[PDB]
Each structure stands twice: as C-alpha cells, then as structure tokens.
Design a binder for this molecule. Structure first.
Ligand SMILES: NC(=O)[C@H]1CCCN(C(=O)[C@]2(Cc3ccc(F)cc3)CCCCO2)C1
Ligand SMILES: [Zn+2]
Length: 140
C-alpha cells in the first residue's frame, strides 16, 4: 500500500483505490495502473520533473529503501492477473529489486522529488508507474 500526497491530490495504484477514492475521483487510467483522488488537507510530496534513471524506492516487505537503476517509461506486457486482463501497461519503468504484491504504492524518488510508485514485480524485478509527465499534479 502507499500513496503520493501532492497539493490536494492523492495518487494511488488504481487496483488498490478505496471507495472514498472513487467517490472523490480526479482521474484514472487502467493502462497505467493509476488513480488520483482529491484531498481536504495539502500534501508534502513534490513531483520530479527530470530525466533521472537512478533513484531510491521504498520496499514495505523489507522495511527498507533501496537504490536502483530503472528503465525509461515504456509499454510492457503484463500478464493476466487477479487485478487486470493480459494487456500492455504504459509508462512503466523496470528495475532489479525485491518486491511482493503488497509493496504496490511504495515511492520511487530521485533528488528532484517523487518519480512514481511501485506497480508490478517479478523474481528479483520491480516495476514503477511513472508520474513525471502528469504536469497537472503541480497545479489546482
Ligand atoms: N500493475 C499490474 O498490472 C500488477 C497487478 C497485480 C499483479 N502484478 C504483478 O506484477 C505481480 C504482483 C506484484 C508483485 C510485486 C510488486 F511490487 C507489484 C505487483 C507480480 C508478477 C506476476 C504476478 O503478480 C501486475
Ligand atoms: Zn530527478
């Protein structure tokens, strides 16, 4: 579990969104595994607006932050699961790192701010949904 809290927005994995998230919906995209809801209180996270391909992510199944190198956002095949049919997930970045399903929502960051959130895994792989192109998160 986990979210990004920027401005009056809460960014979560779409497959983990709550009823309150759906009832206060700003934007959602199944192809990216992202959902954004509105918040009453202002958040403290800042979004990175950069070209970093190295950063650090939080792994809840280890209670640890790990440094990682990650690929550029791309369209990657994600097999049918208990949350989606077989499809291509867009804006996904892969790295070598430990992950488990409950690790979704952990933040990936660089020196510029938040880059994305854990969305996918694999044997020694972790995938992150990028948020750096969502410029509207910085306003309203
Ligand atoms: N974004 C998606 O489509 C995920 C929905 C849940 C299923 N998805 C997965 O990748 C996994 C679960 C997972 C493990 C570790 C993670 F950090 C994030 C998810 C692992 C690979 C195959 C089986 O399920 C894909
Ligand atoms: Zn950066």
């Amino acid at each position: 579990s986990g979210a990004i809290y920027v401005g009056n927005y809460r960014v979560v994995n779409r497959h983990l969104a709550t009823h309150n998230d759906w009832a206060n919906l700003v934007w959602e995209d199944s192809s990216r595994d992202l959902l954004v809801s509105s918040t009453t209180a202002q958040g403290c996270d800042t979004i990175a607006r950069c070209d970093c391909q190295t950063g650090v992510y939080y792994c809840s199944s280890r209670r640890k932050h790990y440094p990682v190198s990650f690929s550029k956002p791309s369209l990657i095949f994600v097999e049918a699961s208990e949350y989606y049919p077989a499809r291509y997930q867009s804006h996904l970045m892969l790295a070598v790192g430990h992950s488990e399903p409950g690790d979704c929502g952990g933040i990936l960051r660089c020196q510029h701010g938040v880059v994305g959130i854990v969305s996918t895994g694999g044997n020694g792989l972790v995938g992150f949904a990028d948020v750096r192109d969502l410029l509207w998160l910085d306003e309203e």
